[PDB]
C-alpha cells in the first residue's frame, strides 16, 4: 500500500516498542531511555527533514578509512599497542566483507609483520617483542588465513603453536590467555580456532575443555566468562563457537541458550545488547546474532524439523536497519551506537553482523535479505571463525596436507 | 617519584640516571602495517622498557619504569608480567603494591590486566581482607562492572566469604532492581550456600521475585530469575505458578508474562499433562499473539516455538500416516 512503511523501525506501531518503566526509575531505565530517545531522533530524521529514507552502506568511505588504517594509525590507537594483530584482522576482514582485494604488496607486508609478532616459543604477541597471548594469536591466524597465500600460511610455526597451547592448558579443562595470565572462555575459543584451522589438534589437547565451557552456561541460558558469572554475548559466542569446533555443542542446554540470545535483540533499537538490562551495541550484531547461525546448524544436526528454511531466529531486517541507520560514521567506519565514535573493532563487527543478517544458508537452501540499496550486500562470513567461508575451507584443506605435529 | 602527568616530567632519554642504557626501538620491519604514530612520551618510555626487558634488568629503576609504561597503556600485558617478575625478584612490599593496584583499577576499571594483577597479589598475600570493600567501591561507580563482579565471586568462593553477600545483593537490588549483575550474584550466593532444593529457600525466592515482578512488571531480570530457578526441576512441577501468572495478566501484563505462560505450557505438554490439546492451542494462540503483536522483534523465534509445539504435541503427532 502507499501509506505502508517498508522500514520496520519507522512504522507507527514501532513507537509501542519504547521502554515502559512502570513509573519506577532506576539507573538502568534512565540509561535505556536516553539511548532510545537518541535512536528515535535518528529514525525520525527523514520525517522531520521531509525526505524519503534511503539506507546506504557508505562503502567508499569505509574503504578509505580501512585502507589507510591498515598502514598507519594515529596515537588514538596507543591503547591498542598490545593488540596489533587484532588491528590487522579487524581491518582485513572488514575489507574482505566489502569485497576489496588485498594487494600482494599489502599481503606480504602483513605476513612479515605477523612473523615479527610471532614468539620463538609459539603463538603471537600484541606486537614485536611482546609475549605471546591467545587473543592476538587468534587474530594473527585469522588474518593470515584471510590472505590465504602459501606465504601467509607458512608464517605459522605449527610445532611451537601446539607447544604454546599445551603450556597454557589447565587441569580443569580451561586455558590461560597467556603465561601468568587470566582464564576465561575466550581462551577455549582462541585455542580451538587456531588449533582447528592449522590442524594441530592432538587427541588430548582439549581434554575437559567442553565440560569446562559447559559449566560456564548459567541460569540465564547464556554463557559467562567463568563458571558462576553473568551471561554475556562475547563469552557466549566464544563458548558456543568453541563447542561447535569440538563438536560438543550438545553439552549445552541449547534450548535455554536460544531463548536467551533471541531475548538480547532490543525491541525498539533493533540491535543486540550484550547482557540483559544493559545497552544496545553494534559489535553484538556479531557476538550475539552470530549465535543464531551456530544454533541453527546445531539444532538441525539433531534433526529439528521446526527449523525455518530461509531465516535465522532473529529479526534480520531490524538488525540491518539498526546498523545502517545508527552505526555508520559519515567520515567512514562503524560504531557502537549514536553518540559513540568509530573504531576498527566496531567496523569489523558491525559489518560481520550485517553480513550474517543479510545471508541465510542451511546447506542447499539459500536466502538473502538486503535492506536498502542492493549495493549494500556484503560477502558472507563463517559463523565460527568470522572469516570468509572460502578462506576457512582453503586454510583447513591446506593444513590437512600437513601432519599433526609429532604425528 | 616523577609522575607521567607531572608538569616537570622529563623524557627518559633526557634522564642522567638512564644514560648507560641504549633505548631499543620497536622492530616493526622495513614497511610497517598498522603502524601507530606514538606520541613522544609513549615511544620514549617504551623504547626504554624494550631495553630493560631485553637485558632482563631487574632493578629499582626498571620497576619504576613499568609504572610509567602501565600508565601509558595499562593493557600491555607484557609490562604487567615483567612488573610481577620485578615484584618478586626485588622483594617489593606487596601491600604497597596493593595500594598501587587499587589506584590503577579505580582509574581504568574495565581492563583485564589490572584485575588479574590484583588477584595475583591477593593470592601471594593470602589476604582477602580489603577485597569486598574495595570491590564495593568500584561497584558504587559502575554497578555492572563485569571484571569487578568476577573478581568478587572469586574472592568470596576462594576465601569462603559468604556471610554478608546476600545482604549486599539485597542492598543493590534496592538501589536498582533491574541490575542483572546483582540477580546473577543473588543466584551465585544461594547456589553455593543453601542451594535451591531446600523448599523453604526456593519458596522464599519465588515470593520475592513475584513481589518484584508486581512492583516493576517490565523488568526482564526478575522474570529471567524466576524462570532460571524453576526451569531445571520443570515448570509443570509447580501447578500454582500458572494460575498465579494468569492472575497478573490484567494489571501486570507484559510480553514477559506471555512468554512465561508459553514456557509453562511447553513443559506441561512435555510431561504429558491433562487436556493435551486444550493446552497446545492456548500455547499456539500465545505464540501468535507474540509473533504478530506483543513481541514481533522475536517473530522468528515465536514462529519456531509454535511450529515445534505443533510438531510434537498435536493430536496427529503420534498418529501413523496411514490412519
Amino acid at each position: 500500500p502507499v501509506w505502508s512503511e517498508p522500514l520496520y523501525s519507522l512504522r507507527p506501531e514501532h513507537a509501542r516498542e519504547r521502554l515502559q518503566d512502570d513509573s519506577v526509575e532506576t539507573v538502568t531505565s534512565i540509561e535505556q531511555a536516553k539511548v532510545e530517545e537518541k535512536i528515535q531522533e535518528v529514525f525520525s530524521s527523514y520525517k522531520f527533514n521531509h525526505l524519503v529514507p534511503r539506507l546506504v552502506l557508505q562503502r567508499e568511505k569505509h574503504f578509505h578509512y580501512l585502507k589507510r588504517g591498515l598502514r598507519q594509525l594515529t596515537d588514538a590507537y596507543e591503547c591498542l599497542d598490545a593488540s596489533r594483530p587484532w588491528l590487522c584482522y579487524w581491518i582485513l576482514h572488514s575489507l574482505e566483507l566489502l569485497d576489496e582485494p588485498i594487494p600482494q604488496i599489502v599481503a606480504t607486508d602483513v605476513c612479515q609483520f605477523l612473523e615479527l609478532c610471532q614468539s620463538p616459543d609459539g603463538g603471537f604477541g600484541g606486537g614485536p617483542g611482546q609475549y605471546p597471548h591467545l587473543a592476538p594469536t587468534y587474530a594473527a591466524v585469522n588474518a593470515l588465513c584471510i590472505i590465504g597465500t602459501e606465504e601467509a600460511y607458512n608464517v605459522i610455526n605449527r610445532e611451537k603453536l601446539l607447544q604454546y597451547l599445551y603450556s597454557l592448558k589447565q587441569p580443569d579443562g580451561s586455558f590461560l590467555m597467556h603465561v601468568g595470565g587470566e582464564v576465561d572462555v575466550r581462551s577455549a575459543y582462541c585455542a580451538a580456532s587456531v588449533a582447528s584451522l592449522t590442524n594441530i589438534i592432538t587427541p588430548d589437547l582439549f581434554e575437559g575443555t567442553a565440560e569446562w565451557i559447559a559449566r560456564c552456561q548459567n541460569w540465564e541460558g547464556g554463557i559467562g566468562g567463568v563458571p558462576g558469572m553473568e551471561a554475556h554475548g562475547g563469552y557466549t559466542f566464544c563458548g558456543l563457537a568453541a563447542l561447535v569446533i569440538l563438536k560438543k555443542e550438545r553439552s549445552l542446554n541449547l534450548k535455554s541458550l536460544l531463548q536467551w540470545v533471541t531475548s538480547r535483540q532490543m525491541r525498539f533499537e533493533g540491535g543486540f545488547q550484550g547482557r540483559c538490562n544493559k545497552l544496545v551495541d553494534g559489535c553484538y550484531s556479531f557476538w550475539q546474532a552470530g549465535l543464531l547461525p551456530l544454533l541453527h546448524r546445531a539444532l538441525h544436526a539433531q534433526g529439528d524439523p521446526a527449523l525455518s528454511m530461509s531465516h535465522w531466529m532473529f529479526h534480520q531486517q531490524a538488525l540491518q536497519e539498526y546498523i545502517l541507520m545508527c552505526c555508520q560514521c559519515p567520515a567512514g567506519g562503524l560504531l557502537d551506537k549514536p553518540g559513540k565514535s568509530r573504531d576498527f573493532y566496531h567496523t569489523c563487527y558491525c559489518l560481520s553482523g550485517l553480513s550474517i543478517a543479510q545471508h541465510f544458508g542451511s546447506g542447499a537452501m539459500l536466502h538473502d535479505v538486503v535492506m536498502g540499496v542492493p549495493e549494500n550486500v556484503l560477502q558472507p562470513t563463517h559463523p565460527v571463525y568470522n572469516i570468509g567461508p572460502d578462506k576457512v575451507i582453503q586454510a583447513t584443506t591446506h593444513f590437512l596436507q600437513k601432519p599433526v605435529p609429532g604425528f | 617519584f616523577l609522575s607521567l602527568d607531572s608538569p616537570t616530567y622529563v623524557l627518559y632519554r633526557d634522564r642522567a640516571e638512564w644514560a648507560d642504557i641504549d633505548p631499543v626501538p620497536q622492530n616493526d620491519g622495513p614497511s610497517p602495517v598498522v603502524q601507530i604514530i606514538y606520541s613522544e612520551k609513549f615511544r620514549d618510555v617504551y623504547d626504554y622498557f624494550r631495553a630493560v626487558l631485553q637485558r632482563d634488568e631487574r632493578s629499582e629503576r626498571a620497576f619504576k619504569l613499568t609504572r610509567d609504561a602501565i600508565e601509558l597503556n595499562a593493557a600491555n600485558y607484557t609490562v604487567w608480567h615483567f612488573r610481577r617478575v620485578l615484584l618478586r625478584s626485588l622483594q617489593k612490599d606487596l601491600q604497597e603494591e596493593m595500594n598501587y593496584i587499587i589506584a590503577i583499577i579505580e582509574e581504568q576499571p574495565k581492563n583485564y590486566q589490572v584485575w588479574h594483577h590484583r588477584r595475583v597479589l591477593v593470592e601471594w598475600l593470602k589476604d582477602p581482607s580489603q577485597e569486598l570493600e574495595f570491590i564495593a567501591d568500584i561497584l558504587n561507580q559502575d554497578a555492572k562492572n563485569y571484571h569487578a563482579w568476577q573478581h568478587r565471586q572469586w574472592v568470596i568462593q576462594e576465601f569462603r566469604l559468604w556471610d554478608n553477600e546476600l545482604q549486599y545483593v539485597d542492598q543493590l537490588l534496592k538501589e536498582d532492581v533491574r541490575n542483572n549483575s546483582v540477580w546473577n550474584q543473588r543466584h551465585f550466593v544461594i547456589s553455593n550456600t543453601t542451594g535451591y532444593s531446600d523448599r523453604a529457600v526456593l519458596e522464599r525466592e519465588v515470593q520475592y521475585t513475584l513481589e518484584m515482578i508486581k512492583l516493576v512488571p517490565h523488568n526482564e531480570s526478575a522474570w529471567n530469575y524466576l524462570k532460571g530457578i524453576l526451569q531445571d526441576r520443570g515448570l509443570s512441577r509447580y501447578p500454582n505458578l500458572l494460575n498465579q501468572l494468569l492472575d497478573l495478566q490484567p494489571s501486570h501484563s507484559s510480553p514477559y508474562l506471555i512468554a512465561f505462560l508459553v514456557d509453562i505450557y511447553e513443559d506441561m505438554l512435555e510431561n504429558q499433562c491433562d487436556n493435551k490439546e486444550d493446552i497446545l492451542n492456548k500455547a499456539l494462540e500465545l505464540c501468535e499473539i507474540l509473533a504478530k503483536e506483543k513481541d514481533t522483534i522475536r517473530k522468528e523465534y515465536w514462529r519456531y516455538i509454535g511450529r515445534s509445539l505443533q510438531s510434537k504435541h498435536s493430536r496427529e503427532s503420534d498418529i501413523p500416516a496411514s490412519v
Binding site: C79, Y345 | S39
Partner: peptide, 11 residues
C-alpha cells in the same frame, strides 16, 4: 591518548 572509557574491551 589513553583508552576511552566509552569504548569496548576484549583483551
Amino acid at each position: 591518548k589513553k583508552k576511552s572509557k566509552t569504548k569496548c574491551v576484549i583483551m
